[PDB]
Design a protein around this ligand. Sequence first.
Ligand code: CA
Ligand code: CA
Ligand code: CA
Ligand code: CA
Length: 622
Amino acid sequence: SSAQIKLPKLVSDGMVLQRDTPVNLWGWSKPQEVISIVFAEKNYTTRADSEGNWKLKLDATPAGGPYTIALSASNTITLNDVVFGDVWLCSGQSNMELPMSRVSPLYEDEIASANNAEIRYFEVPKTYDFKEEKQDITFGKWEKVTPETIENFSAVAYFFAKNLNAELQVPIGLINSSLGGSPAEAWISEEGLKKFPEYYTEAERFKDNDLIDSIEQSDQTRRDTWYKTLNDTDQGIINNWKSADFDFSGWKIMNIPGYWAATEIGDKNGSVWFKKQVEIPKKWLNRPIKLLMGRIVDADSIFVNDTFIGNTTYQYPPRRYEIPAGILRDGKNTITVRVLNESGKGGFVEEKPYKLVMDEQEIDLRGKWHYKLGSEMPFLQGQTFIRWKPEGLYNAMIAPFTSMNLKGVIWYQGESNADTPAEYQELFTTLIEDWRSKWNAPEFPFLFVQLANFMATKEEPGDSNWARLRDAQRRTLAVPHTGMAVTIDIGEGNDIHPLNKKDVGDRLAQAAKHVAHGKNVVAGSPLYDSMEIEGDTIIIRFKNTGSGLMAKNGKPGYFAIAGEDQKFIWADAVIKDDKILVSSPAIKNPVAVRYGWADNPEGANIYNKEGFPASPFRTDNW
Ligand SMILES: [Ca+2]
Ligand SMILES: [Ca+2]
Ligand SMILES: [Ca+2]
Ligand SMILES: [Ca+2]
């Protein structure tokens, strides 16, 4: 702006500023306006440039507060409740976004009690811009941890801050700038994208609003028409199958969990209805009951008797619905589920809870359900996600903050690049260098999360695009002032959004203690350093062994070894100190070792004694 003093949304009441450094305050005014600032009983002045931009440095201030900052020129603004602490930018895709509410079943006591005015959070609006690097955002405010705010905070960011605040005893500010499903190249500026012509040219393409409008309108009409035709052809809607009294005794049966592709319906999309009678004891009546219905591909509405109780519109959230008192009746009760499936295999994910819960008591809902096809629809092609295109997230969600002094970044991203791992080390290195060039800071620690275990286990040695993504992450640790949290032990085979985010936060906090704070503590997880061939044995040396390596719950697992024919076989591995000796009787001249090299390497059990799991790795470049 240029009519009067205006501050960025980030520079606002309740904010955290970075401690112990000359610290930037910035905003807009009239051109050449002289701005008077009073902070900690000292006067500052600065003059705006000819475009009405102004900036200065307040004196280095130690942790604590509160402080006011009074700003005056043609108008006046007071910032209240400002504190000094460590300010962290928190970014990535879905696993950085995932809120405390989504992981609540692991952390109910934490959520109920959360109250810490020194942990403060700033949610950045999730949007893009292809035409320019933005200087502000549309809205946002700093919030403190309270029982009323905690549920919507990023779980990883919250546990990271909880750890650091507990140890360092200073305020922690968290700026959450994340976007589900986003690939790394969405988060890189035009300058960084010059190294990636394919992505540079794509960003340029999307400067055309008419292109955007035509894509979005086409996608919207396809989706709307699909849902409308579905509803108009669904025999369950036409014939009121949601009714508790509908006689479904003639329907066929399938087990839940499971997918209807295994029934005579086969691999059809559209809608399928499910019914079950449940026996409810008298002592469960007139009380609130919880219904867990696992995870469903893609969407569901659930009815209990004649009452709609809830719906979920996409495949990723767990189904956790409440059944208020008064809906269940003595004995004879029906649950009805209408499942909508746009694409892929519709149904109920395995290894998830399907039950009613009251107190510590449960009624298991796994087993036989009656089912019938509602409407067979052709698969619905997914939208073009314009918000995943190169550059747009840098421009609208990172560029606004490049004047903010930070302690560092935490980053959890890569699932959306796991299909193209060969470029990822270079792409992610480019991102880190790109941001550092915008902040221009004496140091800028960049801490990131290696992808978790996911998908099915595998009995024999094999290659894996997820393992290749994880390895690209591990190799990025060559970049200065970086650290990594390993998560191969705390993911879930059947869920890309695992609930254990406290261990993620704690592992990032360990990295921060070492990298950002220069503490004399183990840096995190054991990392492959070097190999030596000696006869039938390869000796692996590790960094970050702390007080020693160990194998949990058995001998060293998930090591494989290969000779020059590149055929890996499960190897024996023995720990000697900070080294692991890997060998197979079946291979006389080994040239390569792999550890935990799978989508889901259950059995990879190497830790340091400080509790941090070794990174998976490979010695080869095949
Ligand atoms: Ca104020
Ligand atoms: Ca340009
Ligand atoms: Ca991709
Ligand atoms: Ca390093």
